[PDB]
Design a protein around this ligand. Sequence first.
Ligand SMILES: CC(=O)c1[nH]/c(=N/C(=O)[C@H]2CNCCN2CCC2CCC(F)(F)CC2)sc1-c1cncc(N)c1
Length: 130
Amino acid sequence: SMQEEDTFRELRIFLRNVTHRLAIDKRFRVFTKPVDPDEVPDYVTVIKQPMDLSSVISKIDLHKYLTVKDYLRDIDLICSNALEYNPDRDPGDRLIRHRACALRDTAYAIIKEELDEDFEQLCEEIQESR
Ligand SMILES: CC(=O)c1[nH]/c(=N/C(=O)[C@H]2CNCCN2CCC2CCC(F)(F)CC2)sc1-c1cncc(N)c1
């Protein structure tokens, strides 16, 4: 309905604001754009389902997220991809893993503090009804 499309619009507005706050954080710059095959060639050998914050923005605008759970699944994918591609004790690996976990923890903390749980429930019930 009209009421339901207004609900999903507010969700998109909220998700755009969270994603922008993540994307401008210096720690998360490595997660802001897809991985250039020129710069690292073996990424596709390890990571079957790439994800990054620019792609999250595009998915928001394509109405791909109808719940915050759907969005958080892509945030979690960014993080688990980073952990999987950087398993070594190497300090470069450990640094990216630390930033990956910080990215995930920061997104969950913002949503826990700022997203009303009745709003997320409404989104879920609209989605369940389709
Ligand atoms: C998406 C992802 O997880 C990813 N992981 C990578 N891991 C590495 O490059 C590991 C490999 N082992 C040795 C150490 N090295 C890391 C060194 C050094 C750490 C600080 C730094 F700022 F991160 C820059 C890299 S590169 C990479 C990626 C690549 N091209 C574009 C994008 N957007 C992300």
